[PDB]
Write a protein that binds this ligand. Structure first.
Ligand SMILES: [Cl-]
Ligand SMILES: [Cl-]
Ligand SMILES: [Xe]
Ligand SMILES: [Xe]
Length: 162
């Protein structure tokens, strides 16, 4: 396991424009296209990210490419974020994957708001960090996924994903 296999499980793969759990237009492996309700807006953005007239469908490769760029960005955002970098850096490898997953899902700003769990993760207070993070709208909205990510922070193993 690694970040790619992990997110590929949590986000799935779809080659046609679909709506995410929030109702937004997305494609491939969790690649958000727009928060706009217009499918036209969705299609334009897609043609732009792909660089061709897709007609709302891409190939697997195109999806894979977008995903690579998306992880890269997520990591780089972490690294650039003064509240995030320190946590990330104090973490072992499995746990970092959990941190990238959340950033991938809710953006750095979203993650950066878990002030208290972040501090607890930094102190290696796993159980505590896990109980704090479950008190979130993130957890109540996508409970299955949140549980797998939280267990990963708690145990530092991939069990939740086997
Ligand atoms: Cl709550
Ligand atoms: Cl879920
Ligand atoms: Xe977190
Ligand atoms: Xe957590």
């Amino acid at each position: 396991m690694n970040i790619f296999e992990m997110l590929r499980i949590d986000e799935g793969l779809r080659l046609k424009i679909y709506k995410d759990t929030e109702g937004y237009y997305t494609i491939g492996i969790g690649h958000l296209l727009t928060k706009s309700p217009s499918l036209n807006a969705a299609k334009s953005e897609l043609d732009k990210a792909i660089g061709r007239n897709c007609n709302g469908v891409i190939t697997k490769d195109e999806a894979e490419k977008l995903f690579n760029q998306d992880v890269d960005a997520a990591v780089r955002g972490i690294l650039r974020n003064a509240k995030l970098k320190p946590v990330y850096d104090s973490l072992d490898a499995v746990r970092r994957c959990a941190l990238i997953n959340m950033v991938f899902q809710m953006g750095e700003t979203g993650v950066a708001g878990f002030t208290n769990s972040l501090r607890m993760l930094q102190q290696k207070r796993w159980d505590e960090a896990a109980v704090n993070a479950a008190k979130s709208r993130w957890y109540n909205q996508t409970p299955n996924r949140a549980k797998r990510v939280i267990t990963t922070f708690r145990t530092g193993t991939w069990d939740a994903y086997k």
